[PDB]
């Protein structure tokens, strides 16, 4: 006899989580509830706030939306039409001195003429071979430089998933990207070199919108708000320390026991298995392969240099810096950092030195999100990381030395990016259908470890599909089948299905 | 006020119209009804009896599952063990007086030394044509050629599908074959000319199970029994004579009205249109294309010769018979034709002449079912096509001429088969997205014309995966991915889901 | 009984006739003797002169020397250094209003930005298509395409050669262009592109040298110089009008009958087959086809301007002017043309006013050549084609509407170019060996007809192979492999061999 | 002052020498001489006879001519038609039990089908690289897998070659093998095999004539007193001991010196060096590869036993025996061996047995030539090589255990195979331009050292082509253009040209 007994329970209030819970107060049949061990939902998706009012996300999060579910939920839990700014999706790689439009390839008449050369060179050997290719590409490297070749690959994408994923491009899969043939666009790029071009990939309708206030972690606050609070249980009180997979039973740190008959859990599943103290599990789930995240946040005086402009974030192939991305989070919203009239004194100048003056300054402020990837490859000092991504800062032009730093971040996350290993997919087989075996859903971003299905919208769906699975013998595929929910717009499914509207009548 | 009303009506209780029933009735949810202007139920996939007592399905109906939510049905309609035959999938080419295997190019080493290299030669060709391709094929003929070569494709693929669609290859597109490249395995086409070897695509882990009474119509008369007998309509009291899809009023033939808040067409389509007397819907579905079938079922006096033995369905590609396939009916039920016992006259000799007596005589008997089609562009002669048949049973060598014909049977079946053309998917996208903005669901194998998916679980599915649409949301796979469900096992959904078992509480 | 005997009769006396009697002379063994219709030897190598001074020579005329043998007979002619000028190999093709280095597709940066994309485009299609190719491409256009593109081809050598060989280039054979593959260096024409690089292929290891004096004529008239007299028959006195092959009997127009033992024909064959009396051969060699040239020459006051510099010759792919090569023939020997004290009257401007003052004024005088071709599918209007060449001189901007014309020239040469049309090949295997079995060697440019051996050094080649495969059983290399001739330096055979040396001891 | 002085000296009266002679016999102009260390005239075309009575040539030596030239002398020498006899081409492949006709991949039908399968599956995977290839094969062994696919390749040309040049096919060079695509017939080869064929590729045309008497030695002989007897100088008092290059001066075993202003030298190039005591060119000589050769001969009693009939010569890709190739000698020439009056007695039997009589038996006879191989990769033991290769003819079912022996003959000749290594262009382009500028035409099987041109009528007609360079400045085609002579009929150079014609005039 547990303390608590319900249908289905689902462990986590991340993304993932939310959806199941959603779902299933859409549903309105089985019982259900939700635990998460923080008392702030969000996950992954949450935002920190620095004692002097710099907001940052874990890293760079934009939203792309695959479906008209996330959509509706999203609407529903922040409504109002200025709970929400809308952005061109503005990005650019750092190459050689100069900022690259994204994609890297269609803009490199940037670049000095006899590197353009030896890329173009590249390209048509990637063509030739393209046009008589008759095998699929078997690593993330291959796929690289068939897309690019040679030049182009070592140019960007090469180093830059290495500082991405922490992981050489020679050790990943590459079905994680679909179905396109690893084939290059001879013809786009040689047009933009030849005319001198250059073109980014966004436009008037190429946007996202990002929440007015809270960060992305507002979005899931305001999600969680709409559920049934006594079906929510998070803080302490809500952390799983068991998983009693025979008896359908989980114990929370405070001794409580919860009864289920099906478990969706979307916490990282390599700790579920240690939850299950299932021997096996632990083995398997320790061959999984992930990274790490650092976060790290700069708060700048001053308003928007002009170098800055309408960036919103940025890659970075090359080695003068630690991080692989950039956010310039100060322009998704207004309140991602304190108002002009707020005084911080300055805590450092970006080449080091202390401010002439310590007195507290007014704004206005930017700031900028960093991102550095940690590993068993690919090692991170965590005393001295923050210097050297301020140093990068500099070394890339983004900050000048003078700069004045007002508030800085740094976190890291142990579990950040699922790595699509080349032995991903035959662990992950081993895994999921065990867990299945004995009524365990187990999905996320580290609940089923499929990164490109790992997005806000795919996370939500996942738990989303996952009771759909439990309740209405729905086909789970955002799990299963990437490459389909990724090359649709899923709109079947709605907030509001016609089980509930016939239900009202 | 209309004198019935329902929240989802379905008309029409082939397995389409049925699939939606069992869903909506599984649900348990919306209130429903289902009608059809045959007191029996079954569509395309009812039986006939001669006079004589021998059993003829619409042509050869053989039942490959691709879900798991039809068998669940089929288990539930048909329960007992003994209510069904299991029997391997063994077919074969009549080809220049020989009965080859299926598949065709593995068994040319049958033909003639000389034949079997023009054959090869052309496979040589299309192979090293595949080898450099970069573009797909574009007509039902190009694919056949890329796949087999030009003297495979005469000898079988190119004919046969003449005398099986009724229009030449080169009209019909190609796409609704799926996504397997179009090119030759030169391989094992040459290896088993080399050995010398014949192979059939069959054996004890490629079967079918079939009714043992009542021919194929037996499943759906049992299915619908199983639905509440006061939510049905069959007979002349159900037969639909015009919707008015601005009203969402249905109109019976005996002036019953139906309102309804959802609806579920599994009638033709282009009547569906003449009945909604939608005049653009009318022209619309005027431009789509399709065969007649002839059905002709032949009783034969005596045990089951050798020459025929095992076979299940045979192919025609050859001018000697009109037919495109013949079944040996017989062998997929006893139940199919009279016991020895009954005293059946011969009414001729299968080659055309009086018997020498006309009195009654014992069986065994053993059964033949043919299929002529017929459309625009291939005129059938409806008062020879009985003779012409049997003809070319003798022809084919099926019926020797002295074979005692006791009874005989030709019906012929309007809308036949929905026709691939290159027009089809233009016509149907102008079409079917036009009937769901006015709450039509049209589904089914003249519902929504796809043969790709028109099979009776295809068809069951596409009722079932409407309802799904309309009450929970679901993705309608099975209509607008055909590749997708035939490419998998469906097996998330089921007779009874999550749903039922929590709701039972 | 004839007037004349001798072992080995050569008729004509251009560049392949006395490469006959250079080698006869040489070898000196057979008797021998050599006629021409012209008082003046060189046949298409030869010179004109216009009244007022200005040499032309029957069209561009520029040496490169294929063998040594050729060699050593004009540096016997013209001993002197200063009999020679020398001048590297520079030449452009005109081409939207610029001068665009040879080779074309190498210098297309001159064109805008948006011709490039296309001409790259082109290319592009070209390599991929290459990168497949398993057929050697049919006629001069397909290899064109395949060696270009698109863009390219429609810019430059279509138009081009259109406007060269007065036939379409779909109505020409393309193995005349040698073995190399149909395919482009797409790799170096982008590169060119990209790097804004022109590069024209001449340079100090790329020279031509030209005659001091007396135009190209002069090389032939001192040739035949080395010749005994009494051997030669040069004028009215030497015109062939009569062939009796079977007699082996030639009858000049005086009379003169002149036995022969071997006939070396240099003659046009379609001429020489009328002279047979042969309407078998007459028929046949009415089936070759060739163009006429009209070579117009234009003489101009003033120094060399700097827009011309040191052009050789230039391309006209452009319908702004009816000529397709013109020359800088003045570029060629300072004795080309007047010297700059001579006084002249003004003829014309080019505009094509003619100006009231007929006052002689000085020079100095530059020169143009122009060449048209005709033929029975390019008609040339001979009445206004010398002032539409000059109207075509002011559009190319090759001269001012102000410039002094001071000379003109035009003529008017029936056979000016063999065409290597689709039928050449079949018709001359029908000739050649017909006139060989009757031990006649019909060889030169329209002597066998095949303009890829057809120049100087080739032309002289057919005379003395001819006259070695007669004597001494050599192979006939030039004529019947000119892509082994072509594609190495002849050095074996020499004006003075070891037979010679042996011999003066 | 030398002893004698010449203008044209040549050394060796094998074919490539006595090619020099006959042509500067033809020409009778500069003055010339003939030496050889032999009486006998041949060098490795002579033919020796063992004491019962049976003749050998140095292996198997089959005349195909590509020159009119060679057959002219030829006719001359041996005129009438009983000097001569006649026989197809016939030859086969020993493998796995079977005789396979040549060419061995049209004859796959006489291995077991299993393996025929995996012949034409390499085949047909070579088949597809070639249609996409974009190189050309770097060496033999490449070669050799493109035309025939692994299968084939393994079964037959890999390890026959290396039992042929001593030599693995990766070691050597292919341009040797012309200029035709490495890519193959796979309709040919599929065809065969499905009809069952063996066919061979001879025929009425395709036919050999061999000498009536003497075997191939009696040939050059023959050749050889056409030769102004005095200018020939063969035996000790022939062998040359010293070239001083410098002096222009041979000098002879017995003393005696000769000037020379040419040299055509056809001994082979690394004896020529050493002869030149020239380091250097020891040193570059002594770099090239060659296999050696030994000669084993066996005379048999019997009539011609059936299973060898009117075979001609063998190749033996398999190791159960030391041979590469045999030769049914007695097949050539009833003269090759005794006539059946003459006694003989046996020697020992085929398995090696004494026989049962001592005392000689008549006839008739017939006869195998067996040829070996050795180089510094495949010794052979000399001492037991003789009875390997009678065990080799039991082995290989060309003689029954019982087969009674009545001759046996085994010689080793040092230079066998010029070896087309890698390496041997590198080499010989170092070389005979250095002997060229001495005035030595060094030319032959061993003289120039390219197997490709290394026939008799190759060796012949570098000696006529070094001769006829040396005086008329003619071509060397047979020695720098092998494909050149190969690919066609050389048919201009006659035995009498139009010189000595008119000369006799």
Redesign the interface.
């Known amino acids: 006899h547990p303390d608590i007994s319900v249908?289905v329970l689902v462990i986590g209030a991340g993304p993932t989580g939310l959806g199941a819970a959603k779902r299933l107060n859409q549903?309105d049949?089985?019982?259900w509830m939700i635990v998460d061990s923080n008392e702030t939902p969000g996950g992954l998706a949450s935002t920190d706030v620095t004692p002097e009012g710099f907001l940052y996300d874990v890293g760079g999060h934009v939203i792309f939306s695959h479906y008209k579910?996330f959509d509706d939920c999203l609407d529903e839990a922040l409504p109002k039409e200025d709970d929400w700014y809308t952005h061109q999706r503005i990005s650019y790689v750092r190459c050689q001195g100069q900022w690259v439009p994204y994609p890297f390839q269609n803009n490199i008449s940037m670049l000095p003429?006899?590197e353009?050369?030896k890329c173009?060179?590249g390209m048509?050997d990637a063509?030739?071979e393209a046009?008589?290719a008759?095998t699929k590409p078997k690593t993330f490297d291959e796929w690289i430089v068939r897309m690019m070749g040679t030049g182009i690959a070592d140019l960007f994408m090469r180093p830059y998933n290495f500082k991405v994923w922490a992981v050489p491009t020679t050790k990943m899969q590459c079905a994680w990207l679909g179905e396109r043939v690893a084939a290059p666009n001879?013809?786009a790029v040689?047009?933009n070199?030849?005319?001198?071009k250059t073109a980014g990939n966004w436009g008037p309708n190429a946007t996202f919108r990002f929440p007015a206030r809270g960060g992305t972690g507002g979005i899931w606050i305001a999600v969680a708000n709409t559920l049934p609070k006594e079906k929510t249980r998070f803080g302490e009180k809500g952390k799983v320390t068991k998983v009693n997979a025979n008896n359908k039973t989980v114990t929370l740190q405070d001794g409580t026991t919860i009864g289920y008959?099906?478990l969706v859990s979307t916490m990282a599943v390599d700790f579920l298995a240690e939850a299950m103290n299932d021997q096996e599990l632990v083995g398997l789930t320790k061959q999984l392969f992930y990274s790490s995240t650092h976060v790290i946040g700069v708060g700048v005086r001053g308003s928007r240099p002009e170098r800055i402009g309408d960036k919103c974030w940025l890659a970075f192939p090359e080695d003068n810096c630690p991080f692989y991305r950039a956010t310039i989070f100060s322009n998704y919203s207004p309140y991602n950092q304190p108002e002009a009239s707020a005084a911080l004194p300055t805590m450092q100048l970006a080449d080091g030195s202390r401010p002439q003056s310590t007195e507290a300054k007014e704004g206005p402020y930017w700031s900028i999100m960093l991102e550095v990837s940690e590993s068993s490859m690919k090692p991170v000092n965590q005393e001295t990381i923050l210097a050297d991504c301020i140093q990068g800062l500099v070394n890339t032009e983004m900050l000048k030395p003078t700069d004045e730093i007002v508030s800085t971040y740094h976190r890291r996350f142990d579990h950040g990016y699922p790595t699509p290993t080349l032995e991903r997919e035959g662990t992950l087989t081993q895994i999921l259908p065990k867990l299945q075996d004995k009524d365990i859903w187990s999905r996320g971003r580290f609940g089923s470890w499929r990164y490109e299905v790992g997005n806000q919208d795919h996370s939500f769906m996942l738990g989303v599909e996952a009771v759909?699975?439990?309740?209405?013998?729905?086909?789970?595929?955002t799990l299963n089948?990437p490459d389909?929910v990724n090359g649709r717009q899923?709109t079947?499914?709605?907030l509001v299905?016609?089980?509930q509207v016939?239900?009202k009548?």
């Not at 070199?193 to 001198?196: D, P, R, S």
């Open positions: 249908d549903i049949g089985p019982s579910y003429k006899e353009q050369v173009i060179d048509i063509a030739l046009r008589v008759n001879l013809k040689t047009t070199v030849i005319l001198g008959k099906k759909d699975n439990i309740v209405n013998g729905a086909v789970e595929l089948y389909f899923n079947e499914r709605r299905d016609g089980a016939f239900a009548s």
